[PDB]
Amino acid sequence: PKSMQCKVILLDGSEYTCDVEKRSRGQVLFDKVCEHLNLLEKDYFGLTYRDAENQKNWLDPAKEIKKQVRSGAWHFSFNVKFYPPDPAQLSEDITRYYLCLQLRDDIVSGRLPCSFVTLALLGSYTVQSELGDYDPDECGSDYISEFRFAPNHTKELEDKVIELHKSHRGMTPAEAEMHFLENAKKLSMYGVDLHHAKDSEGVEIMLGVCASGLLIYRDRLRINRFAWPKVLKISYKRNNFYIKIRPGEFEQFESTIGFKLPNHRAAKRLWKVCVEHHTFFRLL
Ligand SMILES: Cc1cccc(C(=O)N2CCC(C(N)=O)CC2)c1
Numbered sequence: 123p124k125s126m127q128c129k130v131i132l133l134d135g136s137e138y139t140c141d142v143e144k145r146s147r148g149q150v151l152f153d154k155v156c157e158h159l160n161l162l163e164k165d166y167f168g169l170t171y172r173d174a175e176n177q178k179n180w181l182d183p184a185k186e187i188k189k190q191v192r193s194g195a196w197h198f199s200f201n202v203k204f205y206p207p208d209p210a211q212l213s214e215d216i217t218r219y220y221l222c223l224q225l226r227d228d229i230v231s232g233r234l235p236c237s238f239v240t241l242a243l244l245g246s247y248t249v250q251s252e253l254g255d256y257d258p259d260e261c262g263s264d265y266i267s268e269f270r271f272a273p274n275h276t277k278e279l280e281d282k283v284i285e286l287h288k289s290h291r292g293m294t295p296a297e298a299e300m301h302f303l304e305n306a307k308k309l310s311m312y313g314v315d316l317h318h319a320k321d322s323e324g325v326e327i328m329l330g331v332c333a334s335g336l337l338i339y340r341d342r343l344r345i346n347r348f349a350w351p352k353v354l355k356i357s358y359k360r361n362n363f364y365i366k367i368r369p370g371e372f373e374q375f376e377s378t379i380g381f382k383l384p385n386h387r388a389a390k391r392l393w394k395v396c397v398e399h400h401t402f403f404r405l406l
Contacts, residue, residue: 133223149183163217168203205313209303232273245271246286251298358389
């Protein structure tokens with residue numbers, strides 16, 4: 123039985139290596155990673171890989187790994203797939219812990235924009251969780267933390283993290299992680315997966331997929347929001363993605379909004395993440 127080596131980047135930035143039979147479905151690898159991580163609440167997570175176009179794709183647990191990675195290396199990342207709207211309702215601390223690690227990367231990467239004060243508050247909870255109570259021995263007026271807190275670090279941000287860290291004396295890692303999540307979950311881009319698209323008039327927009335529904339960012343003056351209930355059906359054809367929207371009660375007919383994606387694979391990728399989000403958040 124011939125086995126392929128798999129390399130998985132974990133949320134702490136470490137590499138897990140294992141082997142699976144070469145015809146294995148994604149679920150086989152995912153189960154091995156989750157066992158390694160002592161993760162039971164697996165439903166919120168998945169593995170990503172990079173395609174021949176270098177785009178992030180979700181490894182489908184139901185399909186053979188080889189028919190997805192195709193010509194590419196068997197190299198993956200472990201990621202949050204479905205961001206829980208209320209992390210306090212997760213049953214395990216270790217689940218909240220992996221969600222915190224994901225969000226810290228979302229923030230440092232700039233996928234999850236954040237005000238100065240929220241960057242410093244989130245940072246202060248991370249330090250409390252990672253190091254425990256504030257110690258002036260480690261920290262002088264010139265302190266810079268090893269922790270990455272933001273897409274651009276300043277001395278003022280490092281100072282504010284320490285100031286808030288001082289206020290958290292006696293907080294346990296689980297408690298600090300829960301506070302981190304209570305703040306992160308409120309950010310306007312929390313758990314929003316963004317896709318580049320053009321509207322029916324060729325104007326560049328972003329589509330966001332999240333728990334509550336589909337967002338159309340036409341600009342900061344005009345964001346349209348379609349709660350999952352308002353979304354009749356989803357479809358792709360060629361480079362196009364279509365959303366059918368319920369009529370207002372007493373209008374007779376649904377509306378169709380069409381979008382032009384960069385290529386056929388980007389349209390199919392958007393369709394599949396929408397279907398998965400609608401199913402997941404239909405059942406939550
Ligand atoms: C489709 C739809 C319907 C209602 C609200 C939104 C919205 O604005 N989101 C989702 C929630 C998110 C958050 N931080 O909870 C802020 C962005 C989207």
